[PDB]
């Protein structure tokens, strides 16, 4: 038909299929989830082990955009690291401009505007990656935003990206996440990770968890191995 | 950056051919040059009462002694408005005088030719009808998207323009006062227009020794009485 | 090639511009704004499909400046992109011409932005149409609407989205009979317009209503408590 | 057609690079030989009519005093590289004040082979791949060396190499005549044997050009006098 | 820059020709008849008028005839759009000549200057070529009275007499018969052009409005260019209508 | 069909065939293998000759004192990118006056390959890389892809018939950590054997290696030092 | 041209009736006739799995009377009327969709293109229904010449089995026709009702004129 | 227009039947017919290396009745209903795809081409299946026309060779037709079972 | 793993059946075909299949008694019956084998699968030649019968007994040219699988 060839050419129904196909590439990526509470925001990501030949800590899926701003990306890892440095340039230029840390709503806007700029031009291609952006502050509080390949940000009490999303979002709705504390939320995050992954296609994986909130003193910090193993044992109590 | 307008196997430009077919189906517009003034009567038709007639006007002046009407696309016309008005400004910058209509239409029609050559751009979809007053002699010119500008005593443009030209061919002749020029421009406008005719449906303006001025809906209603 | 890039069709039309109009109905929303005597009111539907979705982060009512309100009907990606540039153009007015931009000159520069997308085949047009309100100190309240083609005109009331002709048809009932337009009365017609066409009876949490008045030139979105006060009292009569 | 010069094959190879090597089969045959006593180069003038002057045909060009060169494939693309290779060779002596290793000669020329593209380039960018194959012979601190390049830019050290239309049967013939310590004069004899077999015309003193470089003598082109003494030894 | 939208106007035909150039001359072939004659005492350039309507104004000058400079003039056959830019560029080129050399431009220099611009657009740039063919008249200090002809491909040549547009081959055939080289003067060439105009034009009732005639001659050290008034052309019609029938 | 013409146009499944054709270009090159211990790192490179008379090509490129790399893919695409890798490493010692971290170099390699993808008209770099280096944290084996993806690795084998080596790399992975420099060469050359045909196996002419270590800078071996390394290894 | 006022009245009455004709077949016939032929195909008459007893063998020697197949001829009472009814109504659907074709345009015709692609599939149904009309009448012309030749030949008995093969093809078509005609009712409902919005609205009529 | 809800409810039950029938058609009918016809080719009634039992030594008068070949036709007695079974099963798959095909639009039409090849293959199978039973009818027609022209022309001994070859040709074609129907199951069952994710859900889940 | 109800026992009946087609076809492609090419060469070396001059075969016409077939041609037709029957089965098994080999294809154009389709396209040309000649086996006898018939209708017309004689030569030569096509059938089909068998999928998980 030739209508879906370029993003600058509209479909007969008034849509851009090039942006839609970039979203279908995100559905093949591994699952990553996050939840915000009064104490902070808890991150988790399923990092698939491709081979035993890879060193521990390889293919880190927990991205740090800014001191108070964490990020988890599911999609093409080439466009992921691209936007990763670009999002850091926007946060660095912000502090080079206004002299403090950019709020999460203002950062999600500038990044999403940079994502939508490539959907207009036919000489470039849109991003094939989708990601969530958490933050915490004493004036704002725990905040969680997700940006799609089309460059639109939505506020979320919780979100799930990658292959399995709607299934993980319903499990979060079954229990109130607001009054919980990040110590109890990571217990549910690891619980959902074990529910999402079964042995059918994928073989093995590793739990990559991250915290921001009162426990981390409002700064983006990875979860240590000691607490990670103890958080797994809390999920090892059930599985079922 | 490659030219979208190319020569057909018959030699004619394909892109400008649809430009002339676009302005042929626009809003009906007529004009007449008679005696010391030129009458411009166009069609502004609103699809509902919610529409405010004072917000958007189709008849716009280029300068004091010059005015212009149009039949064709809306957006391409306001691009012509800005550039033609800025051309009259850059004129008054250099020459510090009111611009002659012949020189105004010439360099504005050259802008229409730039997009029949430069790549990645479509030609204009608007056919301009220019009115001007210089040195005591009235001016009525007609320009199309092709870039070729002509001169006419009276003409018609827009939907059913062939009838308006034949009507003025029969009725209109020399020795018509400005009062008769308005009345004659209304009669040829009654033919192309269909339905009830009010002061809001038609937008009329004239240019005379006092310059180009647009008619208020009050005096238009006086001419709707078939008086002058 | 007339249906791929923007070039003259055999009849002289532009199909890429027409598909930009068909991209408006793809949003799945309907908005209405009525110009009143001393006021201008915008009423749009607030959609929160997910329980986890934060309602405070989903807003269809946008603020271009203090005295100008905004609402976007169309593709959400194109909508938030134009408003950012609309705020870039509105601030460029004050940095240049010195005073708060009027709603007419604001819709003109925004329309000129869509004119560049139309004439040039390099950049595609945006599938969103902007509806702007405000109050000019001379002619009073000003309510305008700009389509992706670049057309704008003064409207006594505006309609956009899925419901267009039917929304205008109810607005014709009020203007032809020449009713009296006041702050409450215009909210009476705006809620009734969207409620009767969609067969809903909107709740205060289901909608968001921006308002501007002569006494309150600053644009403000009504609170659910006030919307409820403007609901049951509307349902009273 | 319906593709760019940068478009990959379903097998992952550039069409423009594939057709570039296929165009060398239309060029002129030149056979280089590397020996312990030097590097031998031979090429045919390919005279299709007596009206032409053989002096205007130079298929063996001299890059440096001890460094020679050979030519085949498209003539138009070679004259651009022969000049560029000379300039970079002198830029070496202008910088390091020494003779460039023939491996670095092949290295500097191989850089400009795949630079070709369309977008994100300068006005000095090449549209189409080189249709020329080159042979760089010479003597340096490591002794006589003979190298070869293709349109893709790959340079490889070779004991013997043949280029041109006849390179198919000549390269297979070089493996037969080349054994162990065979000298320059013996390689010259075997060069004329293979070259006379692969050409369609008769071997004459003025029909072919012969040039050799030695460790104790600079690159030298044999004149008509010496060429008559060389062909006599057949 | 999607490839599928490029026609690649630089493609040669299997016979070694350019398509966009050949289609340009065909559009010129439909233009009205325009001719010129080089004579001893002056140059003559006349043309017809294809646009005829009772409501036309034409209160200015000629239609297809333009004035390049004081000592030169030109006619036009082709698309009136591309003619306006060429007329502007020719005047710009002839004026840029006045910058450096500060003398009236020789008729040979102005022709080869525009043709170098025509060739450049067919060589590269991707823009369509020009659809206008131009005739040139004037006087210079070296060669004197001059008449030239230009093609949209950039090719040009000198001519004693020629014709462009409609009925070109018909007028050229008559120029090979009646035209006397080095004998007929500007006065005799005027009656000859009117004779060729009337016979080659199948449209009857030739009027001073329907045709246009312009003369350029050098008198007392000053180039004199004029366009004959409709009454003066009507007088020539009265002269030719006795020498046609009577 | 018409979606393989360029990189920018997405397939209806959201895939770019030109990136796939670039990833299949790397598998058409020579087969090289590399591994690291808790101390040293060894890169075993297979050299091919264009013809029988031609000398073997060089698959090893020296980058930094502690860093080395093996190239598999289009030769010239590696060379332009090698000029980029060496420039960044020279810039590291030009600015920071310290050896560039191998993880930071590979991140710059991907950024260079991310530039051509998102833009129309510019081809991605169709060469793959197996790079090794030693730093304060020990040796590291990294692999890159023309898709711009890059991973951290204990040991890898790239090129044709690499799984027979990777299967060998899985079984002896437990030993790779505690072996010393002489054993890493024995396991590295025996790992190369699985990528090789059943006729031509091991000759010091077409087989070369390189080694980086704790206090040992990266050093390239060709023939003289490789001959005793092949001795005492039974295939 | 020139036209009488009643000439347009004949078109308007035609347009209103043609509208209701397509409205009835869509919202009455299409849903109800699927379960019709579904129960017919599942009815014991069309559900017989034994085709050996459904054959009509005839003796091949005051010669005995030679009838046709009572099953095939009687089972046409289920098939034949649905064949004529579906074809008659598909014509009205074709006529209705063709009547909604707006002024023919060289662009913006996508709404017309959806109509044309539906016209091709509805006419494809009509074509297979016409093939069923052929099979109904062909069985009587083919078997007539087949049995008579089987009657003219007492030397070759297996023509009766050849005549039996026409019986298996007949009853095999009887189940195949009610299966295809039911599939037609199903395909027509799914194609028409889903694309009904585009056929009823081929043009937005937003033209700026 | 105005949608009739009780008209859609009837069709909605029908597609659930088409899905339920397809459910048991893939998991039960398809694999069982593969093993059934595989044992039928292993049966000596079908596969025979020695064709001498098909000899038709016609002799050439009062004449008399001539029947068909017992071994061929009794073998055709099994082949014909199996042709009728596959036609009904392939029509159920086609009808099921007809409601699994999306609406008529131009775009996102790639990836459903696999679904287009499913009934494109069955269309070629239907053409073969119609020709399979047609050759059975032609066998009775051609063999009979050869004997009738033999009874009319006893002086031509070639008609003995016609029936002899037509008998051998048909029996050879019988096992060839079984190889077509059985393998048609295997090819169709392999295409659908692998593609079943995008065949039942071309656009996925809503 | 299907969303439907799938009998695993009958599922395994397909697993074994598909492995039976694969195991048999691999032996037919790389063994049966090349081994019979050599046996078909010895066939053309047989004096029955090496004959230039057909003058030996004359029409045994008494033109009234029955006119039988040509015994020498029938014996040679019997040698073809196992050849024609096998190669028809070969095109039928490999056709199925081609589709079984084709893995899950989501979207796009795989050059390997496209070649596998081009293989069957070349196999249909052989299938047309096999259907034609297999029908000609009975047609040789049918046209011979109608020719002896026309010879009986016109006993004094020599055009028919010249026709019957030339039909005999046309029978044998269409037979011997068929053996060359049977060899070319096994040759090309084996050359297809021998030159490249690789591309049909993208393995190495």
Curated annotation (Swiss-Prot), chain B:
Main localization, broad class: cytoplasm
Function, as annotated: Component of the 20S core proteasome complex involved in the proteolytic degradation of most intracellular proteins. This complex plays numerous essential roles within the cell by associating with different regulatory particles. Associated with two 19S regulatory particles, forms the 26S proteasome and thus participates in the ATP-dependent degradation of ubiquitinated proteins.
Any GO BP annotation: proteasome-mediated ubiquitin-dependent protein catabolic process
Quaternary structure, from the entry: The 26S proteasome consists of a 20S proteasome core and two 19S regulatory subunits. The 20S proteasome core is a barrel-shaped complex made of 28 subunits that are arranged in four stacked rings. The two outer rings are each formed by seven alpha subunits, and the two inner rings are formed by seven beta subunits. The proteolytic activity is exerted by three beta-subunits PSMB5, PSMB6 and PSMB7.
Protein name: Proteasome subunit alpha type-2
Alphabetical keyword list: Acetylation, Cytoplasm, Nucleus, Phosphoprotein, Proteasome
Entry comment on modification after translation: Phosphorylated on tyrosine residues; which may be important for nuclear import.
From Swiss-Prot, chain E:
Residue numbers carrying Phosphoserine: 13, 75, 173
Location of the protein in the cell: Cytoplasm; Nucleus
Protein's UniProt keywords contain Isomerase: no
PROSITE patterns per record: PROTEASOME_ALPHA_1, PROTEASOME_ALPHA_2
GO annotations of cellular component type: cytosol; nucleus; P-body; proteasome core complex; proteasome core complex, alpha-subunit complex
Chain positions found as N6-acetyllysine: 127, 176
InterPro entries per record: Ntn_hydrolases_N (IPR029055), Proteasome_alpha (IPR050115), Proteasome_alpha-type (IPR023332), Proteasome_asu_N (IPR000426), Proteasome_bsu_CS (IPR016050), Proteasome_sua/b (IPR001353)
Residues in coiled coil: none
Keywords for this protein: Acetylation, Cytoplasm, Nucleus, Phosphoprotein, Proteasome
An example Gene Ontology biological process: proteasome-mediated ubiquitin-dependent protein catabolic process
Assembly with partners or alone: The 26S proteasome consists of a 20S proteasome core and two 19S regulatory subunits. The 20S proteasome core is a barrel-shaped complex made of 28 subunits that are arranged in four stacked rings. The two outer rings are each formed by seven alpha subunits, and the two inner rings are formed by seven beta subunits. The proteolytic activity is exerted by three beta-subunits PSMB5, PSMB6 and PSMB7.
Alphabetical list of NCBIfam families matching this protein: PRK03996.1
Annotated family: Belongs to the peptidase T1A family.
Protein name: Proteasome subunit alpha type-4
Gene name, Swiss-Prot/TrEMBL: PSMA4
Curated annotation (Swiss-Prot), chain G:
A GO MF term: endopeptidase activator activity
Modification Phosphoserine, positions: 4
Keywords noted in UniProt: Acetylation, Phosphoprotein, Proteasome
GO BP field: regulation of G1/S transition of mitotic cell cycle; regulation of proteasomal protein catabolic process
Induction: By IFNG/IFN-gamma.
InterPro entries per the UniProt record, alphabetical: PA28_C, PA28_C_sf, PA28_N_sf, Proteasome_activ_PA28, Proteasome_activ_PA28_N, Proteasome_activ_sf
Cellular compartments per GO CC: cytoplasm; cytosol; extracellular exosome; membrane; nucleoplasm; proteasome activator complex; proteasome complex
Disulfide bonds: none
Entries under PANTHER family matching the protein: PROTEASOME ACTIVATOR COMPLEX SUBUNIT 2, PROTEASOME REGULATOR PA28
Family: Belongs to the PA28 family.
Function of the protein: Implicated in immunoproteasome assembly and required for efficient antigen processing. The PA28 activator complex enhances the generation of class I binding peptides by altering the cleavage pattern of the proteasome.
Known partners and oligomeric status: Heterodimer of PSME1 and PSME2, which forms a hexameric ring.
Stated name of the protein: Proteasome activator complex subunit 2
UniProt organism field: Homo sapiens (Human)
Highest classification ranks of the organism: Eukaryota, Metazoa, Chordata, Craniata, Vertebrata
Gene for this chain: PSME2
UniProtKB/Swiss-Prot annotation, chain H:
Protein keywords: Proteasome
Induction: By IFNG/IFN-gamma.
Domain of life assignment: Eukaryota
GO cellular component: cytoplasm; cytosol; extracellular exosome; nucleoplasm; proteasome activator complex; proteasome complex
GO molecular function, one term: endopeptidase activator activity
Record carries keyword RNA-binding: no
Gene3D superfamilies: Proteasome activator pa28, C-terminal domain (1.20.120.180), Proteasome activator pa28, N-terminal domain (1.20.5.120)
UniProt cross-references to InterPro entries, sorted A to Z: PA28_C, PA28_C_sf, PA28_N_sf, Proteasome_activ_PA28, Proteasome_activ_PA28_N, Proteasome_activ_sf
Protein's GO biological process: antigen processing and presentation of exogenous antigen; regulation of G1/S transition of mitotic cell cycle; regulation of proteasomal protein catabolic process
One family name in Pfam for this protein: PA28_C
Stated family: Belongs to the PA28 family.
PANTHER family: PROTEASOME ACTIVATOR COMPLEX SUBUNIT 1 (PTHR10660:SF5), PROTEASOME REGULATOR PA28 (PTHR10660)
The protein's role, per its UniProt record: Implicated in immunoproteasome assembly and required for efficient antigen processing. The PA28 activator complex enhances the generation of class I binding peptides by altering the cleavage pattern of the proteasome.
Subunit structure: Heterodimer of PSME1 and PSME2, which forms a hexameric ring. PSME1 can form homoheptamers.
Name assigned to this protein: Proteasome activator complex subunit 1
Lineage, broadest ranks: Eukaryota, Metazoa, Chordata, Craniata, Vertebrata
């Amino acid at each position: 038909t030739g209508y879906d060839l370029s993003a600058s050419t509209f479909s007969p129904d008034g849509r851009v299929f090039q942006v839609e196909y970039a979203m279908k590439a995100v559905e093949n990526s591994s699952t990553a989830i996050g939840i915000r509470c009064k104490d902070g925001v808890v991150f988790g990501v399923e990092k698939l082990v491709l081979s035993k030949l890879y060193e521990e800590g390889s293919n880190k899926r927990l991205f740090n955009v800014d001191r108070h701003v964490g990020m988890a990306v599911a999609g093409l890892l080439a466009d992921a690291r691209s936007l990763a440095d670009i999002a850091r340039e926007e946060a660095s230029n912000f502090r080079s401009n206004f002299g403090y840390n950019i709020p999460l709503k203002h950062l999600a806007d500038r990044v999403a505007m940079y994502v939508h700029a490539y959907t207009l031009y036919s000489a470039v291609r849109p991003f094939g990656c989708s990601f969530m952006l958490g933050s915490y502050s004493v004036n704002d509080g725990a905040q969680l935003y997700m940006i799609d390949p089309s460059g639109v940000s939505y506020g979320y009490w919780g979100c799930a990206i990658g292959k399995a999303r709607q299934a993980a979002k319903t499990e979060i709705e079954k229990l109130q996440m607001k009054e919980m504390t990040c110590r109890d939320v990571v217990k549910e995050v690891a619980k959902i990770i074990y529910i999402v992954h079964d042995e059918v296609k994928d073989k093995a994986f590793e739990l990559e968890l991250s915290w921001v909130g009162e426990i981390t003193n409002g700064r983006h910090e990875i979860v240590p191995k000691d607490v990670r193993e103890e958080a797994e044992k809390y999920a090892k109590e059930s599985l079922k | 950056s490659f030219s979208l307008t190319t020569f057909s196997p018959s030699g004619k430009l394909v892109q400008i051919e649809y430009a002339l077919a676009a302005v042929a189906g626009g809003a009906p517009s007529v004009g007449i040059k008679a005696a010391n003034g030129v009458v411009l009567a166009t069609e502004k038709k609103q699809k509902s009462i919610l529409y405010d007639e004072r917000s958007v006007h189709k008849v716009e002046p280029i300068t004091k002694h010059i005015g212009l009407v149009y039949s064709g696309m809306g957006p391409d016309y306001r691009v012509l408005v800005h550039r033609a008005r800025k051309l009259a400004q850059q004129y008054y910058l250099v020459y510090q005088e009111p611009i002659p209509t012949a020189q105004l239409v010439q360099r504005v029609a050259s802008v229409m030719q730039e997009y029949t050559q430069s790549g990645g751009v479509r030609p204009f979809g608007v056919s301009l009808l220019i009115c001007g007053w210089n040195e005591g002699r009235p001016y009525l010119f007609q320009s199309d998207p092709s870039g070729a500008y002509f001169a006419w005593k009276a003409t018609a443009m827009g939907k059913n323009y062939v009838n308006g030209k034949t009507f003025l061919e029969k009725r209109y002749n020399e020795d018509l006062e400005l009062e008769d020029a308005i009345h004659t421009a209304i009669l040829t406008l009654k033919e192309s227009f269909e339905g009830q005719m009010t002061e809001d449906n038609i937008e009329v303006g004239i240019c005379n020794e006092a310059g180009f001025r647009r008619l208020t809906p009050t005096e238009v209603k006086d001419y709707l009485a078939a008086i002058a | 090639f007339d249906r791929h890039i923007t070039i003259f069709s055999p009849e002289g039309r532009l199909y890429q511009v027409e598909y930009a109009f068909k991209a408006i109905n793809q949003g799945g929303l309907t908005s209405v704004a009525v110009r009143g005597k001393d006021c201008a009111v915008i009423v749009t539907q607030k959609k929160v499909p997910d329980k986890l979705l934060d309602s405070s982060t989903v807003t269809h009512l946008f603020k271009i400046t203090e005295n100008i309100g905004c609402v976007m009907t169309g593709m959400t990606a194109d909508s938030r992109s134009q408003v950012q540039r609309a705020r870039y153009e509105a601030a460029n007015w004050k940095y240049k011409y010195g005073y708060e931009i009027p709603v007419d000159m604001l819709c003109k520069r925004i329309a000129d932005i869509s004119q560049v997308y139309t004439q040039n085949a390099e950049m595609r047009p945006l599938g969103c149409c902007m509806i702007l309100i405000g109050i000019d100190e001379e002619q009073g309240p000003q309510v305008y609407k700009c389509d992706p083609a670049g057309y704008y005109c003064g409207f006594k009331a505006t309609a956009a989205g899925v419901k267009q002709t039917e929304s205008t048809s109810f607005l014709e009932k009020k203007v032809k009979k020449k009713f009296d337009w006041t702050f409450e009365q215009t909210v009476e017609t705006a809620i009734t317009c969207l409620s009767t066409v969609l067969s809903i009876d909107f709740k205060p949490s289901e909608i968001e209503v921006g308002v501007v008045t002569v006494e309150n030139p600053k644009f403000r979105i009504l609170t659910e408590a006030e919307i409820d006060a403007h609901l049951v009292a509307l349902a009273e009569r | 057609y319906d593709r760019g010069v940068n478009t990959f094959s379903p097998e992952g190879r550039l069409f423009q690079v594939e057709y570039a090597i296929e165009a060398i089969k239309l060029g002129s045959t030149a056979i280089g030989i590397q020996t312990s006593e030097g590097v031998c180069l031979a090429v045919e003038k390919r005279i299709t009519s007596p009206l032409m002057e053989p002096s205007s045909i130079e298929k063996i060009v001299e890059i440096d005093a001890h460094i020679g060169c050979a030519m085949s494939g498209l003539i138009a693309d070679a004259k651009t590289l022969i000049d560029k290779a000379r300039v970079e060779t002198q830029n070496h002596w202008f910088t390091y004040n020494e003779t460039m290793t023939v491996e670095s000669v092949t290295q500097a020329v191989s850089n400009l082979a795949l630079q070709f593209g369309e977008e994100d380039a300068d006005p000095g960018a090449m549209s189409r791949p080189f249709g020329v194959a080159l042979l760089f012979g010479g003597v340096d601190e490591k002794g006589p060396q003979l190298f070869h390049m293709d349109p893709s830019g790959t340079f490889v050290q070779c004991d013997a190499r043949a280029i041109g239309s006849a390179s198919e049967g000549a390269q297979s013939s070089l493996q037969e005549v080349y054994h162990k310590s065979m000298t320059l004069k013996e390689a010259i004899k075997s060069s004329l044997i293979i070259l006379k077999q692969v050409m369609e015309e008769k071997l004459n003193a003025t029909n072919i050009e012969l040039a050799t470089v030695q460790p104790g003598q600079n690159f030298h082109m044999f004149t008509k006098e010496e060429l008559e003494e060389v062909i006599k030894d057949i | 820059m999607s490839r599928r939208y490029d026609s690649r106007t630089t493609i040669f035909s299997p016979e070694g020709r350019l398509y966009q150039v050949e289609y340009a001359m065909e559009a010129i072939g439909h233009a009205g008849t325009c001719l010129g004659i080089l004579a001893n005492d002056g140059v003559l350039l006349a043309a017809e008028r294809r646009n005829i309507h009772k409501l036309l104004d034409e209160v200015f000058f000629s239609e297809k005839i333009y004035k390049l400079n004081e000592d030169m003039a030109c006619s036009v056959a082709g698309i009136t759009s591309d003619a306006n830019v060429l007329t502007n560029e020719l005047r710009l080129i002839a004026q840029r000549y006045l910058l450096q050399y500060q003398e009236p431009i020789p008729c040979e220099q102005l022709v080869t200057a525009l043709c170098d611009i025509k060739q450049a657009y067919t060589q590269f740039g991707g823009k369509r070529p020009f659809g206008v063919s131009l005739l040139y008249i004037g006087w210079d200090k070296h060669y004197g009275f001059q008449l030239y002809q230009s093609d949209p491909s950039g090719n040009y040549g000198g001519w004693k007499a020629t014709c462009i547009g409609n009925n070109s081959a018909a007028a050229v055939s008559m120029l090979k018969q009646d035209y006397k080289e080095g004998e007929m003067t500007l006065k005799s060439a005027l009656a000859l052009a009117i004779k060729v105009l009337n016979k080659t034009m199948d449209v009857s009732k030739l009027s001073a409005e329907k045709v246009e005639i312009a003369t350029l001659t050098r008198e007392n050290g000053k180039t004199v260019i004029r366009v004959l008034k409709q009454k003066e052309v009507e007088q020539l019609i009265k002269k030719h209508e006795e020498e046609e029938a009577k | 069909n018409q979606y393989d013409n360029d990189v920018t146009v997405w397939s209806p499944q959201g895939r770019i065939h030109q990136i796939e054709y670039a990833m299949e270009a790397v598998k058409q090159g020579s087969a090289t293998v590399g591994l690291k211990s808790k101390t040293h790192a060894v890169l075993v490179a297979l050299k091919r000759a264009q013809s029988e008379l031609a000398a073997h090509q060089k698959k090893i490129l020296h980058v930094d004192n502690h860093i080395g790399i093996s190239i598999a893919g289009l030769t010239a695409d590696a060379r332009l990118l090698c000029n980029f890798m060496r420039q960044e490493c020279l810039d590291s010692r030009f600015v920071f006056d310290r050896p560039l971290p191998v993880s930071r170099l590979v991140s710059l390699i991907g950024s260079k390959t991310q530039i051509p993808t998102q833009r129309y008209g510019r081809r991605p770099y169709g060469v793959g890389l197996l790079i090794a280096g030693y730093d304060d944290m020990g040796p590291h084996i990294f692999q890159t892809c023309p898709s711009a993806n890059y991973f951290d690795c204990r040991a890898m084998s790239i090129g044709a018939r690499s799984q027979s080596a990777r299967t060998y790399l899985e079984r002896h992975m437990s030993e790779f950590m505690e072996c010393n420099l002489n054993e890493l060469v024995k396991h590295g050359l025996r790992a190369l054997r699985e990528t090789l045909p059943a006729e031509q196996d091991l000759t010091t002419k077409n087989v070369s290696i390189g080694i980086v270590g704790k206090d040992l800078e990266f050093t390239i071996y060709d023939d003289d030092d490789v001959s005793p390394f092949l001795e005492g290894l039974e295939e | 041209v020139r036209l009488s006022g009643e000439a347009r009245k004949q078109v308007e009455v035609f347009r209103q009736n043609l509208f209701q004709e397509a409205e009835e077949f869509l919202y009455r016939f299409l849903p109800q006739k699927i379960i019709y032929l579904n129960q017919l195909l599942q009815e014991d008459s069309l559900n017989v799995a034994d085709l050996t007893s459904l054959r009509a063998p005839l003796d091949i020697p005051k010669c005995g009377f030679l009838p046709g197949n009572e099953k095939v001829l009687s089972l046409l009472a289920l098939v034949k009327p649905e064949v004529w009814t579906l074809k008659e109504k598909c014509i009205l659907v074709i006529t209705w969709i063709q009547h909604l074709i707006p002024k023919i345009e060289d662009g913006n015709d996508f709404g017309v293109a959806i109509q044309e692609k539906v016209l091709e599939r509805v006419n494809a149904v009509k074509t297979k229904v016409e093939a069923f009309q052929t099979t109904i009448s062909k069985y009587f012309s083919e078997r007539g010449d087949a049995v008579a030749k089987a009657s003219k030949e007492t030397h070759v008995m297996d023509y009766r089995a050849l005549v039996h093969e026409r019986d298996e093809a007949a009853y095999g078509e009887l189940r195949a026709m009610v299966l295809d005609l039911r599939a037609f009712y199903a395909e027509l409902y799914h194609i028409i009702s889903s694309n009904l919005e585009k056929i009823v609205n081929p043009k937005g009529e937003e033209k700026p004129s | 227009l105005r949608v009739q809800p009780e008209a859609q409810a009837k069709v909605d039950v029908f597609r659930e039947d088409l899905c339920t029938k397809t459910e048991n058609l893939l998991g039960s009918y398809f694999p069982k017919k593969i093993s059934e016809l595989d044992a039928f080719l292993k049966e000596p009634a079908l596969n025979e290396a020695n064709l001498s039992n098909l000899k038709a030594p016609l002799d050439i008068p009062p004449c008399g009745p001539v029947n068909c070949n017992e071994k061929i036709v009794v073998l055709l007695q099994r082949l014909k209903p199996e042709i009728k079974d596959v036609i009904e099963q392939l029509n159920l798959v086609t009808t099921w795809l007809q409601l699994q095909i999306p609406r008529i639009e131009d775009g996102n039409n790639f990836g459903v081409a696999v679904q287009e090849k499913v009934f494109e293959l069955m269309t070629s199978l239907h053409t073969k299946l119609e020709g399979f039973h047609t050759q059975i009818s032609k066998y009775f027609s051609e063999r009979g026309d050869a004997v009738t022209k033999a009874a009319k022309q006893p002086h031509v001994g070639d008609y003995r060779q016609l029936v002899h070859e037509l008998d051998e040709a048909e029996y050879r074609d019988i096992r060839l037709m079984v190889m077509e129907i059985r393998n048609a199951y295997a090819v169709l069952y392999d295409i659908i079972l692998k593609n079943f994710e995008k065949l039942k859900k071309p656009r996925g889940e809503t």
